[PDB]
Write a protein that binds this ligand. Structure first.
Ligand code: UED
Ligand code: UED
Lengths: 303, 303
């Protein structure tokens, strides 16, 4: 009868983190079999980061101009290359502690754990979701670039995010493990800003079903809505519209619970139009949106 | 300029988790050098758990009546013993992946990470605090007993909690790694209940300093209080009284920030007596109390 934000266990990823040092710039990278992935801005200097041409910067570099540590050991770079916003560094060693793994591009709304690292060494782990404006509400200090995000699905690590930068509003932006940014950002110390964020409706609904599965039913109601009429209020409270695809996803949850999706929608419309009367759902006073339908099922069981 | 609940990286502890199976009862245990720690109620049957005499139950058991798995491998028990609410099981193998470690008894208010496990295998990690009524607000399903809690301080794991049970209100109770319970609980399926909880004042204050260190100052004020006058309102809002020891602990935070402790107190008294005007501190709408002064310093830096 309890329920909260849970991060994936982080051992499989700890063994892949390493230092990458290039002049006076030090950040983290990811050592999979004989390759090390890291943000390309590791080769800029202080000046460089306002307007770099990474083509230009990288032809100036040698395999020896990159220093890589794994605790004590130094690692020999024997090749380097650029894949969009990451460098791939070849090394003379296969990481013996490389897990079964995949590179995935996540869609917005989806959640993942991030292992926050500094100077190659893990510092903490926490759970995060990709916002609809393609940022994440992270916790990242100077030196965190290269920290990764990931899910685990039956011993197989799915890497989905590498950290590159913090936007003026305090939110964070980055790329998948193929170097393509999430969002319209570029890896440049310039005037960029996060676009308007919205609430992830699918996850809010997922969490209300969790509230019911943990015994709690005070917000439900008799009324009901259509999809169209629910979206009219979604818009004016800045919630993503609900789609038949999203309704379908809430299938197992609505089945386990007895509550049709559009009734949970009517409940949410009621909660939006009237706040919540000094009440809480699963210990929270606010509608929380960083749990997916799949997180909810992972955690709990019973009604 | 961002800030949240962060758990310790969990790799050093993942390598110590194992299954312990005894008839039809299966739970987790902790494999340090040649010893495995686990809750003693692993030897009860369904009936037994209402009123066990664990003396009685254990003289009936043999080293062979305990089954221990570490993934595939089965482990040979060659000794067993009872230390208050834990069993110590001797095995023919030293865990090769045992870290530098300590057993610590935490005090209330202090925080730790828990690695939630089922059938010997890690499932998730999250951050938790020992409430003043000696429970924790956890997330634990059937089969979670034996899951541990821990901090890390320069590569050395400090184990402080083993999970034993869930109280009727949905909160959780357990022991240190010497088998002494936190709180007046016993490991018995009987009528027990959590006593009245209170808010951890020290941590709330710690977090307001974090709010200032992340730029944010809207709740501060000109007024000030004495310690005595602040406690009169602490009582009637169910906050722990503040003590000169607690004032002293907030020393580095008040120094880094410019704000004397009793002024932050006056700010908090103001926030208590007038709610918060649809405002948030570090993204939260509520006074949050599961960060210690030491967590706060760990995370951030800058004003
Ligand atoms: C890489 O370690 C770093 C992580 C930033 C630094 C502060 N908080 C973070 O998340 N990335 C950058 O510093 C980035 C440089 C690349 C785009 C070339 N610049 C940036 O993120 O500007 C924001 C900033 C905020 C606070 C201090 C310094 C920079
Ligand atoms: C050990 O795996 C288990 C963990 C409980 C089970 C459900 N949620 C938990 O945290 N411990 C017990 O089941 C405990 C037995 C020992 C005291 C002998 N009994 C208990 O905690 O009763 C509460 C309960 C709640 C929901 C389902 C079953 C039991």
């Amino acid at each position: 009868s309890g329920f909260r934000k849970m991060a994936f266990p982080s051992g499989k990823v700890e063994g892949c983190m390493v230092q990458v040092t290039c002049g006076t710039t030090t950040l983290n990278g990811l050592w999979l079999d004989d390759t090390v992935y890291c943000p390309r801005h590791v080769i800029c200097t202080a000046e460089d980061m306002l307007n770099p041409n990474y083509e230009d910067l990288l032809i100036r570099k040698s395999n020896h101009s990159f220093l890589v540590q794994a605790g004590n050991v130094q690692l020999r770079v024997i090749g380097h290359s650029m894949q969009n916003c990451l460098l791939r560094l070849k090394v003379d060693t296969s990481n013996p502690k490389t897990p079964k793994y995949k590179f995935v591009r996540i869609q917005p709304g989806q959640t993942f754990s991030v292992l926050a690292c500094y100077n190659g060494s893990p510092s903490g782990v926490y759970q995060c979701a990709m916002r609809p404006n393609h940022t994440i509400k992270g916790s990242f200090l100077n030196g965190s670039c290269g920290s990764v995000g990931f899910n685990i699905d039956y011993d197989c690590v799915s890497f989905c995010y590498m950290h590159h930068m913090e936007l003026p509003t305090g939110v964070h932006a980055g790329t998948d493990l193929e170097g393509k940014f999430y969002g319209p950002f570029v890896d440049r110390q310039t005037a960029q800003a996060a676009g308007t964020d919205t609430t992830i409706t699918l996850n809010v609904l997922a969490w209300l079903y969790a509230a019911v599965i943990n015994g709690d039913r005070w917000f439900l109601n008799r009324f009901t809505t259509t999809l169209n009429d629910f979206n009219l209020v979604a818009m004016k409270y800045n919630y993503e519209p609900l789609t038949q695809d999203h309704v379908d996803i809430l299938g197992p949850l609505s089945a386990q619970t007895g509550i049709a999706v559009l009734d949970m929608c009517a409940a949410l419309k009621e909660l939006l139009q009237n706040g919540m009367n000094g009440r809480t759902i699963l210990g929270s006073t606010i509608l929380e949106d960083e749990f997916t339908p799949f997180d909810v099922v992972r955690q709990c069981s019973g009604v």
